[PDB]
Subunit: 275 residues, 3 copies
């Protein structure tokens, strides 16, 4: 599968909800909040109207990286684009294809691995909302982009992955030969280095070299900081086979404290060597 040319106007509902233990999450339905929030995927040219309701007892917002939006959808208290308790606001995100401007230069398209998060809970930069769990991934695809069999989102939020307790993953499963897409977001206060055992990717927009002429470094380890995002696709077990392949932050105190998960790659019969 490859991505089609975009151009459709889409609508979705989103809600901010309290979860257990002082956490907060986004969901596409009341009672369906999750951390991270739901994956939003768009084709370059698509417009998305996000009909957003704050079900909580404190103000909240939705702010997005990378996409086109007018100042009225900035999602900050500074611009009065936040949402009071019980309120509804329609946020509009737009995207565009690349193309040459009249001045002769190449205008970059929206395609990329992006993310949305809160900007008003706790402080006017969303520090409390982000810690509590108000973040989620946005994928914008260019026409012809290769589509994966599955997508997994890994968020290094301070000293946790996806706000989970230390040493509790998350784990992800695949079968040898699956095309697996990873979205990588970082939040909070610390720099991290994401590492994957047994797999590697290109350090460019799609995480895959375009061909023999792409000079991007091929890596299996990458430093990132708060609100960085990137993504890539790998063929699970390619050249290396089945197994319980760790991924972790490579800052030594961070892995030692439990910023680790498993990429569980099964043989076609469902078994996993040595696990």
């Amino acid at each position: 599968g490859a991505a089609p040319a975009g151009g459709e106007v889409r609508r979705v509902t989103m809600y901010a909800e309290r979860l257990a233990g002082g956490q907060m999450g986004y969901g596409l339905e009341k009672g369906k909040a999750s951390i991270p929030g739901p994956l939003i995927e768009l084709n370059e040219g698509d417009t998305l109207h996000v009909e957003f309701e704050n079900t909580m007892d404190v103000p909240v917002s939705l702010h997005v990286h990378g996409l086109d939006y007018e100042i009225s959808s900035d999602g900050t208290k500074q611009n009065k684009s936040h949402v009071e308790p019980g309120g509804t606001r329609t946020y509009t995100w737009r995207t565009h294809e690349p193309g040459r401007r009249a001045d002769g230069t190449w205008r970059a398209g929206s395609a990329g691995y992006w993310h949305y998060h809160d900007h008003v809970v706790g402080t006017e930069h969303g520090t409390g909302g982000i810690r509590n769990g108000l973040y989620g991934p946005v994928i914008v695809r260019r026409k012809g982009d290769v589509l994966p069999d599955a997508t997994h989102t890994i968020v290094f939020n301070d000293m946790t992955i996806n706000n989970r307790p230390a040493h509790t993953g998350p784990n992800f499963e695949a079968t040898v030969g699956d095309r697996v897409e990873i979205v990588m977001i970082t939040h909070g206060e610390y720099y991290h280095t994401f590492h994957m055992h047994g797999h590697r990717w290109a350090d460019n927009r799609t995480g895959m070299l375009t061909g023999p002429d792409d000079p991007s470094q091929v890596i299996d380890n990458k430093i990132c900081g708060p609100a960085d995002s990137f993504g890539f696709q790998i063929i699970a077990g390619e050249g290396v086979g089945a197994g319980a392949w760790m991924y972790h932050c490579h800052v030594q105190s961070h892995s030692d404290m439990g910023m680790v998960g498993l990429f569980l790659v099964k043989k076609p019969d469902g078994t996993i060597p040595g696990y």
Copy 2:
């Protein structure tokens, strides 16, 4: 408007290091007009710049540049006695070169890029005091044919300040929708940071602009940088997003909460900014 010409010119400028109010120190092109950041120096690949440097201060100081060609006598360090004693003068010479094929068949990278200069001698033998006090500034070297901007703004994350300004006090920059704005970004000190701009994005490559449809550089609005990293880009003000008070800030959460924030004020051609109401 237009594009950078071919280089090759021999240029001179005078540069002064001066004390400023409040324990600051700055470079400038004239006495009593020092600034933090210091003056933007622009060269075209091939140009030579002779910097007639004068220390007006009562302590040693130096001038050390990233990226450009210099011989060891313009290194600007005490370690090889290229610093400037109090009250003294020295000529620092910087050269630039074009890219080109070597005799061995390999491709020699050119000098073009976003670079910077700073002190290497005040407080420690790595300029830790000078850098903290404000002795830093931007250097742009352009390749022949590089697109030229309508304006250029330099943003330096120096420890917990922007351009040595106190928390929450700017700087702010203004533009009109459609302006071609160049941003030069430099980091200094002890901390890593992540630079973010609302409403705008750039390419992670030499010029910040994709060269065309075959450039696979990631397009970003957020980038981690550490001490003495430099990069630059050009954006079209309000492109696809309209006028507004577009924030820029470090995205390390405690850093933005403690004032590492500024405003990119993008106006309509009639001067209006929608919903800007501070």
Copy 3:
């Protein structure tokens, strides 16, 4: 210039983990000759390496490698029982592949790049103690046609040391003007760093040099890196700048002040260095 040939060879080498003077631990290819950093392993894309590994120590130890192809039985972790007990032996196998077209129409990336190996079992299940003690080394995988250097030097920022050495004790590296010098740069431990080289610059891409005039990679002399990052490049020693004691250092100000500094000693043909103290 000289160029890497096509790979495809199957090679074998012995490796040992040994305790070294002063509470350190190192890898080596011969008993009693372990070093920090460990020996440089060089492969052409397609080659296979069987490392016949022996642990001469009193604690379990492993060998884990970045970037290369390996099965789970050569992962080098306790978590899947591919560590080596005291006195034990194990054959670890590393494979590499060329780039090429896939049936789905995508371009599979090759193994070529600047990589590294290290312990994953000493002190903790992530090798924190082993890495601190010095169990790390560089791996270079070359693509057919890659330019070969006159010499290669490995610089490891391991916590607050370079190559586990005390502050202000190097290492220093020697070259003659015109030498083609390869640098492998690895980071380990707990802290981010920014590697900086006076007088020289390189391209932020796979090989550290631009393929030609269509490569838009930023040209840099300063780069932020974190634990287990690796990159490398090649430079012409003194090119456009001449002979001298060219410092390299972390540019985090407190780190360079504390001694994360070394010298790139570039000599004239007669072996002297204008302005230096041997």
